[PDB]
Nucleic acid binder design. Structure first.
Ligand SMILES: [Mg+2]
Ligand SMILES: [Mg+2]
Ligand SMILES: [Mg+2]
Ligand SMILES: [Mg+2]
Length: 210
DNA sequence: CCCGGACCTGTGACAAATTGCCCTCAGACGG
DNA sequence: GCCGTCTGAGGGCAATTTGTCACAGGTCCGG
């Protein structure tokens, strides 16, 4: 199945994208890498890849696409827009898109890689971003260990402000996303909290392959 | 000493957003 | 050439999940 590879600069960039937008983003990165920035998406191809109907596929592409306008990317800093022209459909069931050509070197570079089947069942976009960043530290054999700082998680993934209250961080982001990964990917994930005084400062993740 | 106050935790409520579903009807094609 | 079928572009839904905040209940500080 398709092998995603991506620069670590993208794995650790600051942005806010939905699940549907990240799914499309994987195919753009795949298309670009297999080579001006103009990519293409076929409704019927998207539907088969993610086990959707043609109807529900069309709805996902259309709304994702019009929601890209105004979206930006920050590499730690420098900010860029994803698109430099609105999307448009030349043919029925087919969409044409214009990626910011200045993003090309950030896609292809110290790199991260995973098969697309590993992620196509994750629903929460924050849970996707976590699985990508763990992959960045994965070994050939399938294990790894990493400590991520809570302030850095909040900035890079752009979690909403009420998750600055730690019990909400635990309840609505950490537990759910560890649970999706353990239920929806071939990984098996555990964690422990590092504290300093009263504040929790980092989360230490350990994982292996099933 | 115990207070009021500034921290921290977890849970119950509700509001706002997203999920996979359902139905309608015109476009493109082929036989 | 007309029509039957597969597409996909629209319009909606209720059931779940995600985002937000009040309040109970712990500690330690300082005065
Ligand atoms: Mg959808
Ligand atoms: Mg009393
Ligand atoms: Mg009680
Ligand atoms: Mg009290």
């Amino acid at each position: 199945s398709p092998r995603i590879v991506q620069s670590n600069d993208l794995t650790e960039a600051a942005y806010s994208l939905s699940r549907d937008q990240k799914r499309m983003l994987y195919l753009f990165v795949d298309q670009i890498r297999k080579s001006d920035g103009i990519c293409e998406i076929h409704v019927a191809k998207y539907a088969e890849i993610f086990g959707l109907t043609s109807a529900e596929a069309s709805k996902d592409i259309r709304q994702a696409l019009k929601s890209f306008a105004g979206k930006e990317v920050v590499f730690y800093y420098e900010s860029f827009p994803w698109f430099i022209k609105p999307a448009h459909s030349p043919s029925r069931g087919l969409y044409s898109v214009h990626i910011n050509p200045y993003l090309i070197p950030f896609f292809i570079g110290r790199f991260t890689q995973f098969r697309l089947s590993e992620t196509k069942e994750i629903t929460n976009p924050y849970a996707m971003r976590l699985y990508e960043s763990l992959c960045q530290y994965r070994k050939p054999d399938g294990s790894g260990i990493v400590s991520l700082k809570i302030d850095w998680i909040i900035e890079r993934y752009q979690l909403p402000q009420s998750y600055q209250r730690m019990p909400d961080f635990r309840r609505r982001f950490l537990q759910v996303c560890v649970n999706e990964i353990n239920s929806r990917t071939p990984m098996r994930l555990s964690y422990i909290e590092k504290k300093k005084g009263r504040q929790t400062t980092h989360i230490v993740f350990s994982f292996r392959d099933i």
